[PDB]
Coordinates of C-alpha atoms (C1' of nucleotides) and ligand atoms in Angstrom, one line a residue:
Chain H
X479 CA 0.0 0.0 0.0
X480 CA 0.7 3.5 -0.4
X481 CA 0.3 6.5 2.5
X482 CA 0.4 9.8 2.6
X483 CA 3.5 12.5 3.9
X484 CA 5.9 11.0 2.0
X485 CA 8.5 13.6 3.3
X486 CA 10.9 16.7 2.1
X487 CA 12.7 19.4 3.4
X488 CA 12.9 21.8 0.5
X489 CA 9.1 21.4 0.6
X490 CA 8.3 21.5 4.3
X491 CA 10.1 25.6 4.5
X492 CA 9.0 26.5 0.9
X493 CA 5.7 26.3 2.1
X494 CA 5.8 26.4 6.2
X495 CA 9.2 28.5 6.7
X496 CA 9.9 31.7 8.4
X497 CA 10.0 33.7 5.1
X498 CA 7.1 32.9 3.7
X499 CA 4.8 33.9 6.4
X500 CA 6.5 37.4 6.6
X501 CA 5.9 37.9 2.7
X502 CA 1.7 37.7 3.2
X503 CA -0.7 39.4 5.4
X504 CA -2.4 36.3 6.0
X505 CA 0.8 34.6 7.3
X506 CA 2.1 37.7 9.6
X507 CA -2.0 37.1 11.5
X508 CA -0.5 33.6 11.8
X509 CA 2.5 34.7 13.8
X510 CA 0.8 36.9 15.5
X511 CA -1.4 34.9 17.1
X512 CA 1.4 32.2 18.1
X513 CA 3.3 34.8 20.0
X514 CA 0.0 35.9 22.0
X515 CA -1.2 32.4 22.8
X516 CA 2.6 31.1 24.0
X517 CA 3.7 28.7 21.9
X518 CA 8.0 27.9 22.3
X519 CA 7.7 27.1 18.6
X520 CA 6.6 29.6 15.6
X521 CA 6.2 28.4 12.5
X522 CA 9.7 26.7 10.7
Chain U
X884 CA 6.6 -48.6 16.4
X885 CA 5.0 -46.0 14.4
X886 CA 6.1 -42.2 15.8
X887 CA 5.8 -39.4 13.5
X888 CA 6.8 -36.6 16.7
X889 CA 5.3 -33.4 14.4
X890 CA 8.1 -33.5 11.7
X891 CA 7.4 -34.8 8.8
X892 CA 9.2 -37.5 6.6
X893 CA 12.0 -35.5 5.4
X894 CA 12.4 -34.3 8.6
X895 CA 12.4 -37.4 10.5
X896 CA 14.4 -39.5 8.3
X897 CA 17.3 -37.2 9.4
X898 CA 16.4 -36.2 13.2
X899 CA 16.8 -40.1 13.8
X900 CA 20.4 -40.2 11.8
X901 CA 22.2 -37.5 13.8
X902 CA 20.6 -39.0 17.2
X903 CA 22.3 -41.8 15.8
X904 CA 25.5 -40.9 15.2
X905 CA 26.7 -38.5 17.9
X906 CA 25.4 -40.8 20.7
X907 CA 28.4 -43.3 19.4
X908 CA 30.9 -40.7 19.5
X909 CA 29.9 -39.6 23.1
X910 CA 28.1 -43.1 24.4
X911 CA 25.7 -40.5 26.7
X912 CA 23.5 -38.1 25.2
X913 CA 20.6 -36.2 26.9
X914 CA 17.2 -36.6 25.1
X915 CA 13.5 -36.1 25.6
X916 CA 11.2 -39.3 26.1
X917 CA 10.0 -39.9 23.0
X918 CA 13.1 -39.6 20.8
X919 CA 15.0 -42.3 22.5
X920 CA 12.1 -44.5 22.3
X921 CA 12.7 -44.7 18.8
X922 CA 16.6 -44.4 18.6
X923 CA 15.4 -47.3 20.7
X924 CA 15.4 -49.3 17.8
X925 CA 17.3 -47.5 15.0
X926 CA 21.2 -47.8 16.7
X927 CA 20.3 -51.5 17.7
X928 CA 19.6 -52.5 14.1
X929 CA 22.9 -51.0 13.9
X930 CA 25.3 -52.6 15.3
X931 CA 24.0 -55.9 14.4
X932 CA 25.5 -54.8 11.0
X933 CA 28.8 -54.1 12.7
X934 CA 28.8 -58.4 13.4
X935 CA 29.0 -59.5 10.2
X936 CA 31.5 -56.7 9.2
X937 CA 31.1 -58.0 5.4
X938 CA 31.7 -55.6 2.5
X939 CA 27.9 -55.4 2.0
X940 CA 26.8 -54.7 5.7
X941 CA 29.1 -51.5 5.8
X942 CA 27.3 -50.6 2.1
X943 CA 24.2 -50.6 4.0
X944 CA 25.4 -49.4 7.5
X945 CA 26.1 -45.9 5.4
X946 CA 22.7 -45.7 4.1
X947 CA 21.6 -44.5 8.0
X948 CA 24.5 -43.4 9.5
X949 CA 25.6 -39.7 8.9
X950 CA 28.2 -38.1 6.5
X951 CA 32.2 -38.4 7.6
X952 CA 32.8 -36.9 10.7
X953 CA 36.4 -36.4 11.5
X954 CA 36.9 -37.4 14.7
X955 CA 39.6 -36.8 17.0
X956 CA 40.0 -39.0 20.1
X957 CA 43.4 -39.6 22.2
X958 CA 46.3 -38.9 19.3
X959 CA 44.0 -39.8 16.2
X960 CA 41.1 -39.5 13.8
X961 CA 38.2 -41.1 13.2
X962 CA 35.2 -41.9 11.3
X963 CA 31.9 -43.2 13.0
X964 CA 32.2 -46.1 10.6
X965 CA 35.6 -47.4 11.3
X966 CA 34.9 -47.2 15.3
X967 CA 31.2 -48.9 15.1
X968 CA 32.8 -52.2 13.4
X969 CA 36.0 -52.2 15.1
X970 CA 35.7 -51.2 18.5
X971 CA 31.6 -51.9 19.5
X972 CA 31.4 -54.9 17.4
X973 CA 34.0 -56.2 19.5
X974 CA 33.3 -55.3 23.1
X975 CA 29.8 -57.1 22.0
X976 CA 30.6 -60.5 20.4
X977 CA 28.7 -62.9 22.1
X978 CA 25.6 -61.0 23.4
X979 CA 22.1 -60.9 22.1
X980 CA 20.8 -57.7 21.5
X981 CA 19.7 -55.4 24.2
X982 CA 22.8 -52.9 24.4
X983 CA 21.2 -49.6 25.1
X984 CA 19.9 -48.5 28.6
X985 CA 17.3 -44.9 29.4
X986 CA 17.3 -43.5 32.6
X987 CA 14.7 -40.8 33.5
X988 CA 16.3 -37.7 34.9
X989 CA 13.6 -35.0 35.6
X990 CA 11.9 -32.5 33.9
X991 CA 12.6 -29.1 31.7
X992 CA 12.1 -26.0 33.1
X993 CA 11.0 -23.8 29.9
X994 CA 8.5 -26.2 28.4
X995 CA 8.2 -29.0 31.0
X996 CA 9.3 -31.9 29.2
X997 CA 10.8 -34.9 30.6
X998 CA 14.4 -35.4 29.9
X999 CA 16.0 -38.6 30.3
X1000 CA 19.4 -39.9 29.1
X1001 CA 20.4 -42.7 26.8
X1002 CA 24.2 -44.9 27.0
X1003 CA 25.5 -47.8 25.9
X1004 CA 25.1 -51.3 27.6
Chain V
X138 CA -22.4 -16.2 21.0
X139 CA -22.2 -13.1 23.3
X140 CA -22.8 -13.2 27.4
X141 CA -26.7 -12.1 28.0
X142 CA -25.8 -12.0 32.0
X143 CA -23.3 -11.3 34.4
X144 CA -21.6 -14.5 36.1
X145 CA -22.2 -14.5 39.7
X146 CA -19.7 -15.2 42.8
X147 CA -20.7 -18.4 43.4
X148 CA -21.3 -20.1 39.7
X149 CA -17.6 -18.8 39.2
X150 CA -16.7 -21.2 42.3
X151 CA -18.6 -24.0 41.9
X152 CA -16.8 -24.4 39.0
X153 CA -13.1 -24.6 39.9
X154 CA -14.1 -27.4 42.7
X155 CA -11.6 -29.7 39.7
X156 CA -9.5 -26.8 38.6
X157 CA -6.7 -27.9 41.4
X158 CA -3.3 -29.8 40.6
X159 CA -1.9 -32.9 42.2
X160 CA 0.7 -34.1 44.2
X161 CA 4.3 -36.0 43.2
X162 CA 4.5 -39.5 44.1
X163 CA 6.8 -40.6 47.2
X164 CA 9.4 -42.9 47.1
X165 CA 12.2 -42.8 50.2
X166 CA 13.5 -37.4 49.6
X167 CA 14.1 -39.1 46.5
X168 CA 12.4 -39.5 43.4
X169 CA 10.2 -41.8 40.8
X170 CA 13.0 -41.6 38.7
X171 CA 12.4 -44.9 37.1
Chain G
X1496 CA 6.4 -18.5 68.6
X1497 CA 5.2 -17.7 65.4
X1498 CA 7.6 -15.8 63.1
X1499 CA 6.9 -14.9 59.3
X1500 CA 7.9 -13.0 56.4
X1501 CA 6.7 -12.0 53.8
X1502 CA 8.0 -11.3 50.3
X1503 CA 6.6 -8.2 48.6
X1504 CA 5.4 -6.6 44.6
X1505 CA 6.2 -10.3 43.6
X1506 CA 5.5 -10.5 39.6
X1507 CA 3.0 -13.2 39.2
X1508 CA -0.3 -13.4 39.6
X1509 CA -1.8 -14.4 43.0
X1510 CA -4.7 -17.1 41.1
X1511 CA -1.5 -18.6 39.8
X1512 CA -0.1 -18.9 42.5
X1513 CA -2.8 -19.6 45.0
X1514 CA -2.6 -23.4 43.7
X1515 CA 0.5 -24.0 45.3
X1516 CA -0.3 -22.9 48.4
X1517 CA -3.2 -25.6 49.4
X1518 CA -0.3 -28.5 49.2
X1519 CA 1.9 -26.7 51.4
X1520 CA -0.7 -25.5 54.1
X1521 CA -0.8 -27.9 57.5
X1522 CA 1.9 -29.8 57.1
X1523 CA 4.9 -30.6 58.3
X1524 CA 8.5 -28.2 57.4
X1525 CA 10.8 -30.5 55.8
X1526 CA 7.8 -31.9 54.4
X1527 CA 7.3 -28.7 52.6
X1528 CA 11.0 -28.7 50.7
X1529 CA 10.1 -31.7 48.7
X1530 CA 7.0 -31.5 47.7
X1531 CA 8.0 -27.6 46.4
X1532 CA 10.8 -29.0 44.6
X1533 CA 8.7 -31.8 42.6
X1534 CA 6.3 -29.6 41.2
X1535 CA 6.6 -28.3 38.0
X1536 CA 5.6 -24.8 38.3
X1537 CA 7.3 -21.0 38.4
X1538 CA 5.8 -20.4 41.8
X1539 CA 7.7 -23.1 43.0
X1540 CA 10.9 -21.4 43.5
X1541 CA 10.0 -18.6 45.2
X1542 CA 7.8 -19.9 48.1
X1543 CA 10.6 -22.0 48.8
X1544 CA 12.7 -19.2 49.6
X1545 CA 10.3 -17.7 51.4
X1546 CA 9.8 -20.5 54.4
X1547 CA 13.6 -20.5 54.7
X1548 CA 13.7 -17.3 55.9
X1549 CA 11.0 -18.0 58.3
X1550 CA 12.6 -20.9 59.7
X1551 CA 16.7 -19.3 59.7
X1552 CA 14.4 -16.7 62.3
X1553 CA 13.3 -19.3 64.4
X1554 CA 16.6 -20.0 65.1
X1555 CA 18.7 -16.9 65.4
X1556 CA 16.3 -14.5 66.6
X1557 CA 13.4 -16.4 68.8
X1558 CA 15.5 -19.9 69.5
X1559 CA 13.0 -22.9 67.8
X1560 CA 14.1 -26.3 67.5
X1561 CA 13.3 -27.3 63.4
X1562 CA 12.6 -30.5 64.2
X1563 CA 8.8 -30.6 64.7
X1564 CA 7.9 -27.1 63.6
X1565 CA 4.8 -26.7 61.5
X1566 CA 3.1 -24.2 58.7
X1567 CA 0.2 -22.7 60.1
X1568 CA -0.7 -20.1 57.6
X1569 CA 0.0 -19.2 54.0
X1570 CA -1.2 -16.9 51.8
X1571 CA -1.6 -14.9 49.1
X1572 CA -3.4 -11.3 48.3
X1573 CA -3.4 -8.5 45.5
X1574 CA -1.5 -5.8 45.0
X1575 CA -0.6 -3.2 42.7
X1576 CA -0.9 -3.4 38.5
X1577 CA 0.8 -2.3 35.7
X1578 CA -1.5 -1.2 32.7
X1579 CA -0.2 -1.8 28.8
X1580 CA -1.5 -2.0 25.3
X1581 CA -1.9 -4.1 23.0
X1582 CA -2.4 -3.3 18.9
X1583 CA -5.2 -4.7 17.2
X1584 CA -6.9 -5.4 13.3
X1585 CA -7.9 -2.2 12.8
X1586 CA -7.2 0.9 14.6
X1587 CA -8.5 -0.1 17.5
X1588 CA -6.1 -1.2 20.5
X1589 CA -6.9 -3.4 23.9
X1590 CA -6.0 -3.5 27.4
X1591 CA -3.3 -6.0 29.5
X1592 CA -3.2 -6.3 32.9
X1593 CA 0.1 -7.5 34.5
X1594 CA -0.2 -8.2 38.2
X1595 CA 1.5 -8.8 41.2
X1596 CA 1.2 -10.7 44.4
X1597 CA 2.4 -10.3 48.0
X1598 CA 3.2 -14.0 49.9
X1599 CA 3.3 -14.3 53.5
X1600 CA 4.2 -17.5 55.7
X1601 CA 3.5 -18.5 59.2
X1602 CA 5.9 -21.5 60.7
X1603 CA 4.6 -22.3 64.5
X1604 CA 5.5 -25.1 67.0
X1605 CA 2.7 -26.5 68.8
Chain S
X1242 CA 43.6 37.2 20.1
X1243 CA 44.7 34.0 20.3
X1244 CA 43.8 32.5 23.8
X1245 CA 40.2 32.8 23.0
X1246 CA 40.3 30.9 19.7
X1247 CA 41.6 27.3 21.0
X1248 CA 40.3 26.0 24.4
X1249 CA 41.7 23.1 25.9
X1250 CA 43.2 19.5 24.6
X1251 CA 41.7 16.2 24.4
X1252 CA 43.3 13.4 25.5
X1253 CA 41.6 9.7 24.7
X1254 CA 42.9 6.3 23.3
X1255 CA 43.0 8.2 19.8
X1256 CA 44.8 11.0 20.8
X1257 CA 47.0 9.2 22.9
X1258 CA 48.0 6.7 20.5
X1259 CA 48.9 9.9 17.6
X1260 CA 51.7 11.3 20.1
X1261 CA 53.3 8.3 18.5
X1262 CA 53.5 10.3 15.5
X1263 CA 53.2 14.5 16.7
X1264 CA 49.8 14.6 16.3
X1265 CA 47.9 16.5 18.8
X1266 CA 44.6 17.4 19.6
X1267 CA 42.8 20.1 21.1
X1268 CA 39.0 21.7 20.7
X1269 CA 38.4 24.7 18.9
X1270 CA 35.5 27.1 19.3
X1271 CA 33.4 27.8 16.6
X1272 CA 33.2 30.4 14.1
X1273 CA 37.0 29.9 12.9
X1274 CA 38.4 28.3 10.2
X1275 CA 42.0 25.9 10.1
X1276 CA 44.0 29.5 8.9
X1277 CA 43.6 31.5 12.3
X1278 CA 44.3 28.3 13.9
X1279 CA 47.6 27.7 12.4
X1280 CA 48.8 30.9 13.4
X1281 CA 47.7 30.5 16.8
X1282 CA 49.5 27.7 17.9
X1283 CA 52.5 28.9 15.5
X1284 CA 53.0 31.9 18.1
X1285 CA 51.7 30.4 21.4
X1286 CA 54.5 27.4 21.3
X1287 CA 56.4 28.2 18.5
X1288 CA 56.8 24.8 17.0
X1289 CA 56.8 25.4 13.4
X1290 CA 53.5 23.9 12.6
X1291 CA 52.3 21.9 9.7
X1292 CA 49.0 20.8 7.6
X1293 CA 45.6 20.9 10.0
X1294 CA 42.4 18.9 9.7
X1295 CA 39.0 19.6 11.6
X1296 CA 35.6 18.6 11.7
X1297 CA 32.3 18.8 13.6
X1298 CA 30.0 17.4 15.6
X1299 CA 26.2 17.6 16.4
X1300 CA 24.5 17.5 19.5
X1301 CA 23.9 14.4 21.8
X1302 CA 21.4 13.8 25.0
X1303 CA 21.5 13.7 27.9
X1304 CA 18.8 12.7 30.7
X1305 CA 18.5 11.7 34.0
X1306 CA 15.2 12.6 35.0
X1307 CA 13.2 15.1 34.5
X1308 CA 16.0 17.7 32.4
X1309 CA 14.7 16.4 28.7
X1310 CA 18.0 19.0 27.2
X1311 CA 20.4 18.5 25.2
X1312 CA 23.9 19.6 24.9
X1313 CA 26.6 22.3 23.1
X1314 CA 28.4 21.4 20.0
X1315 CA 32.3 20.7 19.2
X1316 CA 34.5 21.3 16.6
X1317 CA 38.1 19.3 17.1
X1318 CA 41.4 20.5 15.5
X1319 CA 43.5 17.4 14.5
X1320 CA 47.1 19.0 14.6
X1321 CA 50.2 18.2 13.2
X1322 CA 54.1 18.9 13.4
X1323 CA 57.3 17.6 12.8
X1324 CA 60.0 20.2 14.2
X1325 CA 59.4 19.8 17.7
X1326 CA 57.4 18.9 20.2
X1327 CA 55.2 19.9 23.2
X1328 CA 54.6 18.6 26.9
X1329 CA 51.2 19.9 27.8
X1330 CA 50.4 18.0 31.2
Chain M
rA1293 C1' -21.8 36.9 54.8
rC1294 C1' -15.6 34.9 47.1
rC1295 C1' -13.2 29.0 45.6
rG1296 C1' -10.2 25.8 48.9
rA1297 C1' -7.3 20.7 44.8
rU1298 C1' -13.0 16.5 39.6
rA1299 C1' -13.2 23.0 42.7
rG1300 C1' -10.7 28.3 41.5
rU1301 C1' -7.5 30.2 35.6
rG1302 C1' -6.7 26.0 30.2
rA1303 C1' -2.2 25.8 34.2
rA1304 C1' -1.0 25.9 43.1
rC1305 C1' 3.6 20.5 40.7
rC1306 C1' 7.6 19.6 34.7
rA1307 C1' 1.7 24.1 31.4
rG1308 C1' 0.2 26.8 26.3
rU1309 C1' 4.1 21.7 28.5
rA1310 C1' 4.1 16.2 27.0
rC1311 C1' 0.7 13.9 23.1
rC1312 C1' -2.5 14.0 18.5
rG1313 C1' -2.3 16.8 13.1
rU1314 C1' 1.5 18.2 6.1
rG1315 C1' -0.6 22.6 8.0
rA1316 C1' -3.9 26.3 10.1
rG1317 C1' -5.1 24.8 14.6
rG1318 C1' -6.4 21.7 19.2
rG1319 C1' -5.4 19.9 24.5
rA1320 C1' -4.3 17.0 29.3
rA1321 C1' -2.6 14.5 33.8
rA1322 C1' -0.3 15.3 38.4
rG1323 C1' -0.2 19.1 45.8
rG1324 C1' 0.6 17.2 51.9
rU1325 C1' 6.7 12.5 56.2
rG1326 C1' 7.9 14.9 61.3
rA1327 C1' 8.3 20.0 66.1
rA1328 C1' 13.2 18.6 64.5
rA1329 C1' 16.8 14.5 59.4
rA1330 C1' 17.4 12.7 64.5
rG1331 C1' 16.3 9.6 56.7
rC1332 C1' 16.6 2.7 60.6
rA1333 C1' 24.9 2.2 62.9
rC1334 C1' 24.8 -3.5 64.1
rC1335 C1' 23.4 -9.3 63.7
rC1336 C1' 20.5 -13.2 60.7
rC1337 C1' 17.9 -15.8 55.8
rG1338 C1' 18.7 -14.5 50.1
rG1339 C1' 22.3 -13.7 43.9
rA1340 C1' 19.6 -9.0 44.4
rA1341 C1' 14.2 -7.1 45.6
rG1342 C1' 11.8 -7.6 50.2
rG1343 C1' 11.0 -9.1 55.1
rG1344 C1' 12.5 -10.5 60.9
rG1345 C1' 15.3 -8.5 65.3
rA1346 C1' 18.0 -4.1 67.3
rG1347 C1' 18.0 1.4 67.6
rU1348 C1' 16.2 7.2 66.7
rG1349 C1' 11.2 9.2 68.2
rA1350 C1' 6.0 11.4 71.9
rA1351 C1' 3.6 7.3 68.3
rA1352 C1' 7.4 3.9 62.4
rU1353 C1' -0.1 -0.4 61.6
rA1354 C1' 4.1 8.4 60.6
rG1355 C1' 9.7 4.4 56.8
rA1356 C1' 10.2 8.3 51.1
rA1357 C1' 3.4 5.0 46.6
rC1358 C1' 5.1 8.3 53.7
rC1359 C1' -1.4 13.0 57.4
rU1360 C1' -6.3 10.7 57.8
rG1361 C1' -7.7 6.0 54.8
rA1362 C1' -14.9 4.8 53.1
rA1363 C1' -16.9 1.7 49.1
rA1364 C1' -16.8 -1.7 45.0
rC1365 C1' -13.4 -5.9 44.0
rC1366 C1' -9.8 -10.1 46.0
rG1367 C1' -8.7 -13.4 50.1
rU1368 C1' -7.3 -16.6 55.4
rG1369 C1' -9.8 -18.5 59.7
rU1370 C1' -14.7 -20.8 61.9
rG1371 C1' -20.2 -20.6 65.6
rC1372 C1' -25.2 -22.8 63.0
rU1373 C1' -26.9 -25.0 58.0
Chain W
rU650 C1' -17.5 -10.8 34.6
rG651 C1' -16.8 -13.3 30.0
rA652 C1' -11.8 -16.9 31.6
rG653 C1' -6.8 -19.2 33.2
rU654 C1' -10.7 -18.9 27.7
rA655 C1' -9.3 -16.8 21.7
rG656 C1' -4.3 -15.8 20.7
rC657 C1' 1.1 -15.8 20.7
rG658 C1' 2.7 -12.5 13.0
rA659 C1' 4.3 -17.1 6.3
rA660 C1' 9.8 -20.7 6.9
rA661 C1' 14.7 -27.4 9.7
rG662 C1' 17.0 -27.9 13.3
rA663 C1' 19.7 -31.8 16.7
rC664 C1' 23.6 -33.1 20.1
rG665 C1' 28.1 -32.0 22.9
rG666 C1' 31.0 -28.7 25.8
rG667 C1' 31.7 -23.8 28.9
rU668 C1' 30.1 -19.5 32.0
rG669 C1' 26.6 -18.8 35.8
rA670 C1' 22.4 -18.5 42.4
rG671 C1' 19.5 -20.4 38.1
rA672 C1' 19.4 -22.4 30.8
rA673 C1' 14.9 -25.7 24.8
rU674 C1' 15.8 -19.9 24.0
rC675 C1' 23.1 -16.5 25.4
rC676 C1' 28.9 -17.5 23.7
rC677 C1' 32.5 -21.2 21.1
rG678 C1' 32.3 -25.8 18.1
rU679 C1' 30.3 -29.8 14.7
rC680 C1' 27.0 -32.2 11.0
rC681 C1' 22.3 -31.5 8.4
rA682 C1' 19.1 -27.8 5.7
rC683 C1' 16.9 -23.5 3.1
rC684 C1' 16.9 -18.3 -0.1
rG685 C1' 19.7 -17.8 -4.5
rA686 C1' 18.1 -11.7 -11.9
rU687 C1' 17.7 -13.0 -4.1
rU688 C1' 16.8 -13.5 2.5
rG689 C1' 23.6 -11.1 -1.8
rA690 C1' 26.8 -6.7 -2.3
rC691 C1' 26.6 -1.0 -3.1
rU692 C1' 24.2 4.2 -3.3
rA693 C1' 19.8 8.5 -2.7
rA694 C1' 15.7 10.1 -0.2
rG695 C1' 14.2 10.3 4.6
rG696 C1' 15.5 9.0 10.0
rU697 C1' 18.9 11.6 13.2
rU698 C1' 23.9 9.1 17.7
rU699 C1' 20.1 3.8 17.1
rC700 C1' 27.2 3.0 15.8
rC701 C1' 31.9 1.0 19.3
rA702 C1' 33.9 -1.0 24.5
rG703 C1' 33.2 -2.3 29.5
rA704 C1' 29.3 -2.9 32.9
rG705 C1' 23.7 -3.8 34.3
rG706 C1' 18.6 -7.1 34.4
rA707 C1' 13.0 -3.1 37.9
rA708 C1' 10.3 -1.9 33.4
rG709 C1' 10.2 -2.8 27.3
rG710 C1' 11.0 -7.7 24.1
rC711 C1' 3.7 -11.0 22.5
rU712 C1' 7.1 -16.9 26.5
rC713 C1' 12.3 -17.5 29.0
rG714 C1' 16.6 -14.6 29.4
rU715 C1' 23.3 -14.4 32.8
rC716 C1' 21.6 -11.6 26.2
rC717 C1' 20.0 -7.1 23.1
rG718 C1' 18.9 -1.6 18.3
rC719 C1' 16.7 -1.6 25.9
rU720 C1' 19.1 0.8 31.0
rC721 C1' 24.0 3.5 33.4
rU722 C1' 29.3 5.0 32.0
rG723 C1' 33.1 6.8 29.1
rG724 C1' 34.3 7.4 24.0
rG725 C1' 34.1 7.3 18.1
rU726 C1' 32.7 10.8 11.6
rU727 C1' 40.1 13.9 9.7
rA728 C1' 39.7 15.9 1.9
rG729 C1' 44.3 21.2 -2.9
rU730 C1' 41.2 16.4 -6.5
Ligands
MG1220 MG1 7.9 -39.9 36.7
MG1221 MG1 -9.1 15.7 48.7
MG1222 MG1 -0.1 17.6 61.2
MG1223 MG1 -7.0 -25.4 29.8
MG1224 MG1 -16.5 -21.0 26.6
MG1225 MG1 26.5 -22.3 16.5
MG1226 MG1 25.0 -2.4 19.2

RNA sequence: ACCGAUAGUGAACCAGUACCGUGAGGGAAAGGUGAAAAGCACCCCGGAAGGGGAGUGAAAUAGAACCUGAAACCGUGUGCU
RNA sequence: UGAGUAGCGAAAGACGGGUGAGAAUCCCGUCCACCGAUUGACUAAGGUUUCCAGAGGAAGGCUCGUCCGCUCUGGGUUAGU
């Protein structure tokens, strides 16, 4: 049989890194609602 | 007779023909029941080959008994096959059968099995 | 094929009345080692 | 005199065990050794040293002869579990219950 | 600046059996390359140095208990000479 | 004329933590020795665990799962049947 | 409770000797046997110290276990191509 996540690493930060939630408005709202809640980990 | 001991005929045919062998070298081994039961009857229809001694009774007592094993006793080498009609057939010249003897030591302690061992008599 | 009731306290214990073991023989301790 | 001990978080069940027990209970010391010894069991070993430290205090501590000394109680009772998991057909799992036991023995004179 | 570059030596089965040969070990801190190491040792000791290796290492883990951390990182400087010599102990 | 550890905050302790999800995002459990560490020197059984004596203490059936310690559930003994 | 019940994941092992409180199951040795355009040998992704040596046996290993990819301790990845 065949499952999904079949990993990658150029994949998992060209779509979840640092740099691509500072480049949209949407993805700056995501940070900034990680720092208010807590969390030790934003997005990498 | 008439033991099949969950192993079937290719199996058998050559559980019974190492039990066979190494018990000569060693004249004690340490078995469970049934096995020497029927190693009971095997070895003794083995040395009653070693009698005779003829050139066809060593044909036929290879048939059974298991592939060269190099011995090494005190200073020497050996073969299973030129100790059984040298040295056995000798000690035993002028009894009828009945040379083997079981004793019944206790049981296992992993699958509770009675264990008994098996010489030469 | 599936339980309809509960098994009571007792039912449960009048069953094992055989569910014991038994007892080595006795010979002089040594043993039937024949 | 009665002295005891008792052996504590033992890992095996106590219904396992509990079958031993009712051949070793009003009898006889020395003929508690042998019977132990000629049963084919895992509890075996483990009540056996368990009246040997009730009788090497009968003799060191409260002064007992061990030639007629008797077993007057012996027992077994529950203690504390260990929960695990096993994996199933599906996603689904199940439980497993791994138990323990605490044994205690009473030897007496008359 | 030199005494902030390299730290302290290593001494192992490894590093005790290259003394057979004048190769000595120590551990570098990061953020420098084999160059400002050369020179370092060149005017601590003044040995006449030769050719360097290095490498890395990652962190490991350690845990005993409730302290789920894990620990700093090396960088080892393999050295090599063969005018002279150097007691360290 | 507010709660007093299933309550009060999601969090009295390791808490936006472990753990679940590609991701956005979701969510826990868990407090108490004694006035004082004086935390059981020493002897005996055993490979060790654990228990029996001795000894500290006002009490160790207060011995680190340690304040009290109900019920379900599991057992040993026996006065009538 | 159901209940000491269903189950214990495709497959050839037997004897002898040694260490140990303790061995069908660990170490050494013999014969037999199986896979074999693969149960062989190399590399990439991805995983991230699981690698090595002495120790250790409460838990984990679908049994046992003096053994281990598990638990303590110290150590091991070297480039002008
Ligand atoms: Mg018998
Ligand atoms: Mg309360
Ligand atoms: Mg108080
Ligand atoms: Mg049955
Ligand atoms: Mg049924
Ligand atoms: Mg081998
Ligand atoms: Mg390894």
């Amino acid at each position: 049989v065949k499952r999904t996540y079949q990993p990658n690493k150029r994949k998992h930060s060209k779509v979840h890194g640092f740099r691509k939630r500072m480049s949209t408005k949407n993805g700056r709202k995501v940070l900034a609602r990680r720092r208010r809640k807590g969390r030790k980990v934003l997005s990498a | 007779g008439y033991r099949k001991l969950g192993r079937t005929s290719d199996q058998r045919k050559a559980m019974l023909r190492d039990l066979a062998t190494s018990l000569i070298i060693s004249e004690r081994i340490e078995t469970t029941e049934a096995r020497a039961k029927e190693v009971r009857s095997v070895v003794e229809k083995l040395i009653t080959l070693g009698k005779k001694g003829d050139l066809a009774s060593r044909r036929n007592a290879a048939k059974t008994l298991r592939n060269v094993e190099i011995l090494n006793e005190d200073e020497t080498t050996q073969t299973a096959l030129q100790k059984l009609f040298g040295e056995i057939a000798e000690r035993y010249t002028e009894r009828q059968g009945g040379y083997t003897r079981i004793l019944k030591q206790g049981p296992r302690r992993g699958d509770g099995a009675e264990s008994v061992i098996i010489e030469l008599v | 094929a599936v339980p309809k009731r509960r098994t009571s306290k007792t039912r449960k214990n009048k069953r094992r009345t055989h569910f014991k073991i038994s007892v080595p023989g006795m010979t002089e301790e040594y043993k039937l080692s024949h | 005199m009665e002295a005891k001990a008792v052996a504590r978080t033992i890992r095996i069940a106590p219904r396992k065990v509990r079958l031993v027990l009712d051949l070793i209970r009003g009898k006889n010391a020395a003929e508690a050794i042998a019977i132990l010894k000629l049963t084919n069991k895992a509890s075996s070993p483990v009540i056996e040293k368990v009246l040997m430290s009730a009788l090497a205090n009968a003799e060191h501590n409260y002064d007992m002869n061990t030639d007629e000394l008797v077993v007057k109680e012996a027992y077994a009772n529950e203690g504390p579990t260990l929960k695990r998991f096993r994996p199933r057909a599906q996603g689904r799992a199940s439980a497993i219950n791994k138990r323990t036991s605490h044994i205690t023995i009473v030897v007496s004179d008359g | 600046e030199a005494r902030d570059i390299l730290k302290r030596p290593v001494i192992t089965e490894k590093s005790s059996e290259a003394m057979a040969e004048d190769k000595y070990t120590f551990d570098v801190d990061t953020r420098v390359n084999k160059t400002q190491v050369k020179m370092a040792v060149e005017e601590i000791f003044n040995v006449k140095v030769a050719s360097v290796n290095i490498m890395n290492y990652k962190p490991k883990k350690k845990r005993m208990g409730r302290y789920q951390g894990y620990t700093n990182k090396r960088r080892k400087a393999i050295v090599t000479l063969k005018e002279g010599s150097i007691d360290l102990f």
